Amino acid sequence: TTLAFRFQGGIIVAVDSRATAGNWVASQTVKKVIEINPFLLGTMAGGAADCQFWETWLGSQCRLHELREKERISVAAASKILSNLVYQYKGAGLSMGTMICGYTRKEGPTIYYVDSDGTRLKGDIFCVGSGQTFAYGVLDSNYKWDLSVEDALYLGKRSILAAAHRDAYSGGSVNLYHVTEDGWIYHGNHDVGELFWKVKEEEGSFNNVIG
Amino acid sequence: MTDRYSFSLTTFSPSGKLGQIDYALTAVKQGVTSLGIKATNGVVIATEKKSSSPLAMSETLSKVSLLTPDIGAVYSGMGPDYRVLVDKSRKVAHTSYKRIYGEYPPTKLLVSEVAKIMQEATQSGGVRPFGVSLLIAGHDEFNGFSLYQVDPSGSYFPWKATAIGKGSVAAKTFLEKRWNDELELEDAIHIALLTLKESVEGEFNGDTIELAIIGDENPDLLGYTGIPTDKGPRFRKLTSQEINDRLEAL
């Protein structure tokens, strides 16, 4: 489960940390956010290798653009480098669900959805992965453009938690990011084990689980 | 190793001359006389068989070559250059025409293809021009009878009658006097033998003279019967005996 949404205070990016091989839980501490550059973020869904290798390579391509043009790459240009690359490999079996999120003065806060079929979409809200439906249900219900930064951060965290619970192939921990004009800011790693019980107690939700 | 000569060996001199083409034409001038005459009902092409040795069998060396059933070629200049051009000419008549349209090319278009091969030897890397001039006589349904000259440059011109090689200047003057637009094929053969006697010095008979015609269709030379539309080749090479018969009434 990965989501990214635009609001008054910038972009919120939230992801889980579970990796699975069939029904086997391979890891719970996987970094599904690649940091690319100080104003650019990438989410990873689908093949772990495909996403990790082609987003680490996208950071290299973005660095080269800034060395040759003496200017940071735009979110539009960075997203299209990745989308044009995966389109070359179309039908070879690459599996990727990715979101390129960043701020630049000329674009403002921007989110691009890019997948291995070659789809490239600009949007205010995106949820990608097996748990995307669970995340969407929470986000869409409580999403306002004029959300406070503190509320937006919580909603992203809360939306991943919802997906982590209901989706078998999502879980482990929640990783939170906030993107503004000054760049992206890490808002920590929240273990779902501890988070779930805190949220249940404070929010009064999750009444379907044996309290 | 490998062909490192990927640059032109024929270039413009400050005077605007293409040296290697000019020199190729000089080689043609040294060549044995050959001529062509166009009649109303056919075309004749003729040349001397300059025999290298009397021990040599002059029959085996063919200066007059069939290109298609209705097109024949003779040359002046370097024999080997002619032999490979005939091979390339026969093949291009098939690859670039017959295998596409299911019929043999018209004279002007086969000439055009031969001209193209000779132009390429003028501009391509690591090659000299062909040291020959060709006279190509042919017939086709929509253009009728025609006679073309092709030069080392790749240039071609249609002729009523002409000559190339050793005694061409004198031969062309002779043809200008004798040629009219009402000539029958037998008359053109007669004039061809008269014109060629001037340029030949030694023996003048059917064994030292090579002569072919583009005339009527020859059913007897086709090799099969049963298809009415197939009436046989218009190209016929005259025999040693057939030439000697026309030298008595000369």
Added chain:
Amino acid sequence: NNYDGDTVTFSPTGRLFQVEYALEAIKQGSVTVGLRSNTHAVLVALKRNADELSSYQKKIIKCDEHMGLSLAGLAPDARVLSNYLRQQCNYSSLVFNRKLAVERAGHLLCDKAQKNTQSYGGRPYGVGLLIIGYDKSGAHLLEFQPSGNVTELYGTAIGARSQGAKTYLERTLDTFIKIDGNPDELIKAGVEAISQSLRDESLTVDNLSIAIVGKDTPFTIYDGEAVAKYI
């Protein structure tokens, strides 16, 4: 004169001038010495600087754990040939689990150099190499010349004023050949040998470059304070 335009042209006396000019690049190059016993083989190299503000050009290149060379002439050509030796040493290890024989190393350099003396467009290599190694038949020293001529020797020297060091090794032959199981003494003999090729300048700490390979000694290069012992 008329026959030195390229490497594909013999002279009327049967000489290849482009090869002989490549050989000349080596004579201009800084002196390097090679010598061996039955147990160890040593390379000693006089490194050359552009000026006092510059570093000293590295002369010794490692090819494997059991083999390496010193260069005199065009350094970039030494890089090309040493890289080729590294790959051939590496091919021998990966495919045959076999350390490449120093003799075969010679044969491969010879055949690579030769092809560049018979083909138009290409040029001969402009560097001479001294290859030392320890393989299954003990210690070895080779002299490579870009003509393609490779020679197995007890000792030798190449570069400017190399004849001095080569004469010394010719005299000392019977002494240094029997320096078995004593690295420091064999190096000392190599340092005393290169000293016969010095004029005005003497061996300093950042000037001298030594390398050694042997029975229980991997190919190791000594530079800087590590060669202070032998001055």
Added chain:
Amino acid sequence: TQQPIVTGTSVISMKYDNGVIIAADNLGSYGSLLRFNGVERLIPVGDNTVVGISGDISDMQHIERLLKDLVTENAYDNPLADAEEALEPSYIFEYLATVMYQRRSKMNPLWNAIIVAGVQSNGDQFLRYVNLLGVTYSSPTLATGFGAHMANPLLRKVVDRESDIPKTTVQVAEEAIVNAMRVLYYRDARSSRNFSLAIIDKNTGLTFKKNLQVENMKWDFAKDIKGYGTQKI
């Protein structure tokens, strides 16, 4: 991608105190168990290494030529070709192992199981296995095909671990190999009575026994067996 047509059955081998033993029957098996005698599957490479090959015969004969080719190549510009720079079992194995793996990676494998048996220059016994997948492993006892299932269990009673190799003599090892070959004859439909056995000993060199036959077989008890349960006659 291919399918093997004519194949050789199991190759069996073990280490003893002073060397290794390798053996293989001389038979070519066709499609529906059709047989053909007259196929040597033991390839002596030099005088310190024997290569035993099972699987496709055509691919075996190709590998045979590579090894003959390899010996020729090693001699080229090599004064010590018959001494210090002579081919070693470890070199021959690594060449074959390299070829098998790059052939499987091109999806055009050599359909074989190979055991390289030899003694190294320092007298160390060398026994290693490679197959069409390029999979390699070493053990005190090595066998291919049926041999892995039936010969290995018998050979492992003699040499279960590395520490048993010094205690095992050539007389014991040869008996164990010759006994194992008889068991394979009893129970393998693609085996033959005739086999070849090769001994590589550091002290005595390489001994190559050819045209060998299975002897002291037990068949007498067959007369007492009647029907498949209830039949008395």
Added chain:
Amino acid sequence: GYDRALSIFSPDGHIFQVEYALEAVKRGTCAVGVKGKNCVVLGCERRSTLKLQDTRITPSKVSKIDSHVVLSFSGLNADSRILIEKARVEAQSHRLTLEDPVTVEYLTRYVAGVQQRYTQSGGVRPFGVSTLIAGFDPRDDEPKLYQTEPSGIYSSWSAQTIGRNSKTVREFLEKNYDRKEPPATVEECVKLTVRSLLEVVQTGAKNIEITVVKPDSDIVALSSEEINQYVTQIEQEKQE
């Protein structure tokens, strides 16, 4: 393929084929570039030895690379077409991958890169062409004017001229162009460009071409009568 190294070094450290390419440029008709406060103007000479010309269809001296960038040149006309085509292809290629039109500096750097590559590639001679590349970066009102030459060096100019008698018109611009206060309006900038060409041209009839480029893809070519009015005004003020 034809491999021969045609551009090589001489003992004195010069590359004659690159330097002989500059001679081809010096032979070319004069081209001038003047950038104002809120515009750039490209003036171009047309030799008057060619009458009975069809000015409708004849290749124009100023070429649009994109809707916001223009390229003029001095030197071999045939060579210029190959640089203009490559530049036009790269302009559309940049829009396709970066989702933004080229900066004037980027388009210059590309053309200069092509010109450089032909100075150390086997089998090829350098371009007998220098270019003036002018326009406005996307969403930017700062005027840009760059020059390229056969060697492959490029640089930015307040004003610059290339081609035959360029040294004369460069002399004029060096004393008549103020860095601290450039031509404020379009009229002022066009006038200074025409004035600078009138030092060299001969007559101000069908011999001078003017193209005015303004921000946000606003490029227009002036007609004969429009240019002729500037010629008439300058000559009347001169007589003093």
Added chain:
Amino acid sequence: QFNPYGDNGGTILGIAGEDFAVLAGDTRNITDYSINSRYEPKVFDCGDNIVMSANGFAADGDALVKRFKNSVKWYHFDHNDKKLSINSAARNIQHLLYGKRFFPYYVHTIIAGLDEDGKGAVYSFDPVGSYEREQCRAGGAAASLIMPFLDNQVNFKNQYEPGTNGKVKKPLKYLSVEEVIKLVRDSFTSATERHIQVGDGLEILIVTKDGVRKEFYELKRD
């Protein structure tokens, strides 16, 4: 049709301490229900204080280790005998593995060593080169048997402080090399009992600042 892949069984285990790291593996090589070898090492010293194992298809595992050892050799040649840091090795192996993304190496790869601050490091890779630094990782046949045990005994997961009503977790702490080798030995004897492809022998390579030390222990041969 020819199948280019096989399963040679075996299981491997990496654990990172404070100032050390261990990489363990059983020495049994199998195909189907046969034992190929009772002692075939698949944990290798690669130089620069990096130990490696590529468990799964032995041919692909041997090929990858061979290629990485060669990568270390050429890193020395090309970068003035610079030491290859464990993080740099990990990135290099990603590129080796992803190089064959469309004809993968059927191996689970684990490397162990010290990071540039001298602290114990373990990296684990999927077949196509996705990698992650971990305190603890088991790989191969019996990974599913060993991994939950390590969660409990190394990372103290699901253990709470007695009396605290399950509010205060059992505090994380670094284990000694002696305590880690105990967990490795018990992990493998446990896996030997319940997994047919695991047994014969256990080879542990321990990596400290002093270098690479080996320990061997017998396992049941059934």
Added chain:
Amino acid sequence: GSRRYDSRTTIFSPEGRLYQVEYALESISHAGTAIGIMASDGIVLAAERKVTSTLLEQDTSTEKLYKLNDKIAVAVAGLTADAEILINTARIHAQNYLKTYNEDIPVEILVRRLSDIKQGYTQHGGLRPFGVSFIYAGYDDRYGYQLYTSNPSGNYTGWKAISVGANTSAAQTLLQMDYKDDMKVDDAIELALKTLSKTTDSSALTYDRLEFATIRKGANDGEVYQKIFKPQEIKDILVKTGIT
């Protein structure tokens, strides 16, 4: 090696000229004169055959004037063999454009591409350039009637009236003198012949030494006809203008 025998056909002189291009232009200056004149209602192409022989077949001969498509023709000056290579290329380029867009190729696009091929032979390949200058006479629905020339350099330019080959200096002065913009085709025919008649190196200009062609809108309602004049039609137009 082979470096010894390389003429280096694609290099600059110290003055910054292309040797082989300059020498090719020298070649073309000796070729028979070709004149193109563009009127308001059509285009004239007139060319002089190179010293004709009496026994040359005049009626079934094509030396100077070639058809590229139904709307575009060229007059040749230089090596005929070289011209035919380029003409066949141009004929293919025109059909490629028609196949792609289902529209007849605009005149300038065909000219630019043929000119770009010539340019290539001067900048790379190490081959001699094409010893050919073309006069392109064409019509399209954008610019209407158009005259262009190209030369071995690969440079091309547009014209109201132009000459290539021999005595262009003399020919261009006569055209510049008598040409005007509101001219008719019939007037342009008379100008073309009068110009050749005065510049020719021959004693007198006769039908047998001329090739002639017009591109008119003489066909019914908004369609272009290409008329390659027969020998007898040249004989008639030569008497009608009063040159014979």
Added chain:
Amino acid sequence: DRGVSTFSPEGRLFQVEYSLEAIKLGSTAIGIATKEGVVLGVEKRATSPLLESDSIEKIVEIDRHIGCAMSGLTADARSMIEHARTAAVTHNLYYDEDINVESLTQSVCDLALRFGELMSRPFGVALLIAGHDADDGYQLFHAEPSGTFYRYNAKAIGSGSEGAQAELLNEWHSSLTLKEAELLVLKILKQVMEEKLDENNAQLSCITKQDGFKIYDNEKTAELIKELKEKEAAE
């Protein structure tokens, strides 16, 4: 004519020796290495006063830890810079680290001799490559078109090189501060430059471990030029 890869009777490659003559004609570039950083300075040398001097880029960033100054046929440097940037970024992709300054230099020098009858001629430009890495600290290298590179404590290339190098010989010591090195580059540039040195016709840069590679603003360089003049008048 004659071959491109031909040896002279003295044993040098003609085309390499001739390229070194092209580099002598180039504008001056000076590098000084210290324990506090490496300073790079260049003579811009505008051909005309109308040419906007800020558009003359003869000091170039390769990575955050490696800078580059050029002298000679500067157009030839574009593909060398491209290769260096690609090598630096590619090495970071393969090994997740900064690439050694020596390894980057060695990579650039491997292009140098890839010419013959590959590209048609050697490069006509010399590079000063200045950088920092953890192993060998602050480094300055001189990359020639011969394929050879030397490390230098200080180095001048271009028209005024032989004069500038003699001045660097006396002035350079192992205890130079960064501020001292900046003034020293400006001092030696003003000595060998034709036109009078100001912030428009000269450019300074440095590479420090902390802030990486930075090209100095005209305002910053102007203050150091003013500081330089006062200190020379002070004694």
